[PDB]
Amino acid sequence: MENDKGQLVELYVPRKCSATNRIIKAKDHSSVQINIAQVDEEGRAIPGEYVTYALSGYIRARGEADDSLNRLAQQDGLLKNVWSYSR
Amino acid sequence: MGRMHSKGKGMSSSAIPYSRNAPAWFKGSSDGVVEQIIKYARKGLTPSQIGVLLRDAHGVTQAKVITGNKILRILKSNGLAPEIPEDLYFLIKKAVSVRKHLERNRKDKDAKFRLILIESRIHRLARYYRTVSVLPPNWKYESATASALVN
Amino acid sequence: PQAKILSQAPTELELQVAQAFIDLENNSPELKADLRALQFKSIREIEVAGGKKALAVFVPVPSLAAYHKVQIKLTRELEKKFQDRHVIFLAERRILPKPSRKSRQTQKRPRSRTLTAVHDKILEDLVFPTEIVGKRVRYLVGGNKIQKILLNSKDVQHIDNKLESFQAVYNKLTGKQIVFEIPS
Amino acid sequence: STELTVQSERAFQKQPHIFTNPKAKANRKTKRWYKNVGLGFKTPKTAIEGSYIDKKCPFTGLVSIRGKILTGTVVSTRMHRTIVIRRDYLHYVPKYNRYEKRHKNVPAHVSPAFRVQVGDIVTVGQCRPISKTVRFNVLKVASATGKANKQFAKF
Amino acid sequence: VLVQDLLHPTAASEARKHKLKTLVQSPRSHFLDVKCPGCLNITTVFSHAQTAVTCESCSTVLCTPTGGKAKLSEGTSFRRK
Amino acid sequence: TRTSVLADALNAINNAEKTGKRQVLIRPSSKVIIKFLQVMQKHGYIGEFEYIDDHRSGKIVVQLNGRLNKCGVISPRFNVKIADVEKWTANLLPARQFGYVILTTSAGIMDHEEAHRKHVSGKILGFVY
RNA sequence: GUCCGCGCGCACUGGUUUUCAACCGGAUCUUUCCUUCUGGCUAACCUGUACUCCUUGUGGGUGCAGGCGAACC
Numbered sequence: 001m002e003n004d005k006g007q008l009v010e011l012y013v014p015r016k017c018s019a020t021n022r023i024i025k026a027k028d029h030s031s032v033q034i035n036i037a038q039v040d041e042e043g044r045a046i047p048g049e050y051v052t053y054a055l056s057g058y059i060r061a062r063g064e065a066d067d068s069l070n071r072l073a074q075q076d077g078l079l080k081n082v083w084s085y086s087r
Numbered sequence: 088m089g090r091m092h093s094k095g096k097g098m099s100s101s102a103i104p105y106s107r108n109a110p111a112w113f114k115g116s117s118d119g120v121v122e123q124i125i126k127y128a129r130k131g132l133t134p135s136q137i138g139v140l141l142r143d144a145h146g147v148t149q150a151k152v153i154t155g156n157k158i159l160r161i162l163k164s165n166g167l168a169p170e171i172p173e174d175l176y177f178l179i180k181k182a183v184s185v186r187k188h189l190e191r192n193r194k195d196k197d198a199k200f201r202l203i204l205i206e207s208r209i210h211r212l213a214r215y216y217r218t219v220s221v222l223p224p225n226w227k228y229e230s231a232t233a234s235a236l237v238n
Numbered sequence: 239p240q241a242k243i244l245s246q247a248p249t250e251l252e253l254q255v256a257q258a259f260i261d262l263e264n265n266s267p268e269l270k271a272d273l274r275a276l277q278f279k280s281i282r283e284i285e286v287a288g289g290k291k292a293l294a295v296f297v298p299v300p301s302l303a304a305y306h307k308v309q310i311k312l313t314r315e316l317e318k319k320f321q322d323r324h325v326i327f328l329a330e331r332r333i334l335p336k337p338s339r340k341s342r343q344t345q346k347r348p349r350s351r352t353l354t355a356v357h358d359k360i361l362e363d364l365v366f367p368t369e370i371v372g373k374r375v376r377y378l379v380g381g382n383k384i385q386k387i388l389l390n391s392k393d394v395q396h397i398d399n400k401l402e403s404f405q406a407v408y409n410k411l412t413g414k415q416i417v418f419e420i421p422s
Numbered sequence: 423s424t425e426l427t428v429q430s431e432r433a434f435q436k437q438p439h440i441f442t443n444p445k446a447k448a449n450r451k452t453k454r455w456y457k458n459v460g461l462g463f464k465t466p467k468t469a470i471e472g473s474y475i476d477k478k479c480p481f482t483g484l485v486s487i488r489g490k491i492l493t494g495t496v497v498s499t500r501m502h503r504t505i506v507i508r509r510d511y512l513h514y515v516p517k518y519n520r521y522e523k524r525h526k527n528v529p530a531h532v533s534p535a536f537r538v539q540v541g542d543i544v545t546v547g548q549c550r551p552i553s554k555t556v557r558f559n560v561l562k563v564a565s566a567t568g569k570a571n572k573q574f575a576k577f
Numbered sequence: 578v579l580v581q582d583l584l585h586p587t588a589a590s591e592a593r594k595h596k597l598k599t600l601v602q603s604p605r606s607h608f609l610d611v612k613c614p615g616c617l618n619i620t621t622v623f624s625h626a627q628t629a630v631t632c633e634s635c636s637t638v639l640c641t642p643t644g645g646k647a648k649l650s651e652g653t654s655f656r657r658k
Numbered sequence: 659t660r661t662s663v664l665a666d667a668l669n670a671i672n673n674a675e676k677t678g679k680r681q682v683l684i685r686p687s688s689k690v691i692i693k694f695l696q697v698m699q700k701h702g703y704i705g706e707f708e709y710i711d712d713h714r715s716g717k718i719v720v721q722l723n724g725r726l727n728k729c730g731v732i733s734p735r736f737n738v739k740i741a742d743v744e745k746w747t748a749n750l751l752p753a754r755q756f757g758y759v760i761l762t763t764s765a766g767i768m769d770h771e772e773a774h775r776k777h778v779s780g781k782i783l784g785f786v787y
Numbered sequence: 788g789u790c791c792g793c794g795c796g797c798a799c800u801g802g803u804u805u806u807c808a809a810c811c812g813g814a815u816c817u818u819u820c821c822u823u824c825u826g827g828c829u830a831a832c833c834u835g836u837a838c839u840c841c842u843u844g845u846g847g848g849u850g851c852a853g854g855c856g857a858a859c860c
């Protein structure tokens with residue numbers, strides 16, 4: 001990954017899941033990069049600005065992706081009490 | 088869920104509460120409960136029955152919490168400990184009853200199988216009690232010493 | 239009658255505490271006929287953050303139950319007399335060392351004498367009026383252990399303001415940092 | 423042991439070259455020579471006060487203790503003045519990187535001074551060959567009772 | 578699932594689940610103080626009482642044996658204590 | 659029966675991490691499990707966890723952070739010399755750049771890196787990487 | 788400091804309380820003992836005595852009965 005001399009020999013430093021924090025393979029043909037555009041006070045979606053979430057293939061396959069994205073939205077101040085940390 | 092002699096996995100049990108100390112609503116005292124336990128013991132009730140009575144007819148949740156000591160140790164410290172441990176005595180009773188039943192009629196073979204099973208159970212428990220020295224080391228269970236301990 | 243109910247009389251602060259105790263012994267019809275046959279084990283003081291103090295008495299473990307059966311009223315009285323100092327009754331304890339395998343056999347020590355059970359008892363009796371109903375133990379990513387204690391929501395009014403005082407007392411006594419909590 | 427009657431057999435039983443002359447009007451029972459085997463081992467009082475002879479005794483006899491000293495659990499007592507000691511241990515099989523339970527039975531010669539019953543643990547010591555199979559001689563009966571210190575129950 | 582507070586679950590979760598499955602197991606039974614119609618003598622009774630708990634004063638049954646909680650005498654008064 | 663409590667704890671953690679959870683519930687919770695999990699934590703393979711006293715062997719609830727990929731106990735606690743630890747790190751760990759054979763030394767339960775540095779070895783518990 | 792190919796970021800010698808990270812300790816005090824003593828032997832200074840040799844200033848010694856053992860039998 002790293003040489004002695006101080007250069008990154010590792011190639012294409014990859015992303016990870018934003019829900020399970022697990023790595024996303026090069027050909028994980030289920031992982032989705034959701035983009036949510038930011039919104040100002042008067043109700044205009046700011047162009048060229050947004051927030052990103054890389055949901056993994058495994059969570060989508062299991063079917064628990066929606067709950068995970070509720071959690072990410074709630075913790076980042078995108079939604080109000082959609083998701084309860086307790087159950 | 089073990090069921091050392093059946094494929095069953097039942098886990099019916101009792102959940103002892105978190106509160107180590109006595110419940111706040113209890114109105115008696117320790118020595119009165121101890122005397123009540125001693126009176127029931129002198130009546131001739133095995134420790135489990137005494138605990139059951141204290142649960143039912145009185146406000147004792149479990150006497151270990153109230154009296155600061157466990158029931159059998161209370162009888163033993165006051166010279167009322169049975170010479171046979173209560174569980175082993177009841178197992179003696181079951182085994183001798185089944186023995187007499189097979190004496191009455193022969194061809195009930197499932198009863199014979201269950202009798203062998205009970206002999207297994209009693210041998211296990213007797214080995215345990217003999218190892219921990221609660222019972223004399225020359226104690227056995229073959230034919231008629233059983234009824235002698237029963238009668 | 240000061241030095242005769244203290245088992246010795248250094249540290250004059252506890253002499254004055256016993257003097258206040260005797261002044262409460264004047265209140266005969268309800269707080270006496272039982273309160274005379276009591277002793278103490280060199281009461282001592284512990285700093286408490288915010289400019290406060292925590293004065294802990296120590297029981298010779300004869301029948302602590304006797305102190306507890308009168309503990310609430312006597313504690314309130316000692317708090318109204320003694321300003322800016324929160325008083326606590328503790329069970330003075332002779333914890334025994336763990337037997338090092340190389341050390342000498344000493345008629346095996348009872349399990350009630352161990353440091354862990356001693357800490358259990360001292361934290362149980364640090365607040366008698368409220369029963370302890372839960373214990374949680376967490377470890378921060380920095381590896382420092384923190385204990386949460388769940389006290390009943392009922393009977394909480396008897397303390398209601400003293401939680402940081404017990405925090406300071408326990409932290410000074412044993413170094414086991416605590417955070418108190420009550421179910422809602 | 424001999425049952426406190428060494429003089430039982432067809433021959434006299436005495437320590438060679440130790441005696442009391444009848445001409446001496448001091449009347450101490452018999453001169454009983456004894457020795458301490460070393461290694462910080464306590465000679466029992468009943469060895470000095472005893473009347474047995476036991477040529478093969480480590481204290482009152484002529485044998486000596488040197489070399490190996492082993493601790494074991496007595497397993498057989500039925501033979502006279504000699505004992506069968508079990509020794510349990512583990513053999514390390516390296517092909518499996520594992521251990522195996524194993525045991526060896528060592529005969530030993532026990533002095534009458536010691537009271538030994540099946541179940542004890544005995545610290546025994548090496549000695550000059552006593553007989554065909556015995557080469558060990560009892561030194562210390564450690565776990566004499568264990569649970570036999572207290573027998574009955576009366577609160 | 579996949580994100581929970583097993584340490585702070587909802588009280589509904591505590592109630593619904595079988596005992597021995599909660600974070601800490603506490604028996605679902607309880608103790609009650611009960612008044613017999615005949616004599617005013619109050620008596621304490623375990624919820625799943627086994628043997629018929631007659632008052633020590635009089636031969637009046639207060640609970641009857643049952644697989645679960647015992648069945649009362651239809652006239653006595655119970656209060657959760 | 660639960661012959662190896664440590665094995666059950668690690669089997670639960672592995673199952674849940676494979677499922678992709680963030681929290682696990684270790685049932686029997688002996689102190690050796692506490693030591694093992696806090697070694698994991700000091701090395702960061704795990705997050706903020708919690709002991710739950712029940713007056714009966716306690717319980718544990720553990721927060722994950724997806725870092726963990728494989729746990730595992732070596733249930734027959736073999737004696738390992740200081741010489742043979744390299745054989746075990748060859749046989750278990752994917753590479754010597756990371757990974758830790760967790761074994762009990764006279765100091766205590768601890769990873770093989772600190773075991774090598776302390777120059778001490780004992781019985782072997784498990785492996786984490 | 789020495790030097791050596793714009794320089795490696797001191798290639799060879801040290802200060803390292805400029806902090807600083809440790810990682811093993813060791814000794815400490817925890818309500819926390821190091822097997823313990825009986826004497827040697829006390830090593831040594833809690834000694835306490837004639838005292839200051841040594842700037843008035845405990846920076847150090849001429850020095851022995853109560854006395855630290857852990858420097859060793």
Ligand SMILES: [Mg+2]
Nearest residue numbers: 661662663688
């Ligand atoms: Mg175990």
Ligand SMILES: [Zn+2]
Nearest residue numbers: 613632635637
């Ligand atoms: Zn009635």
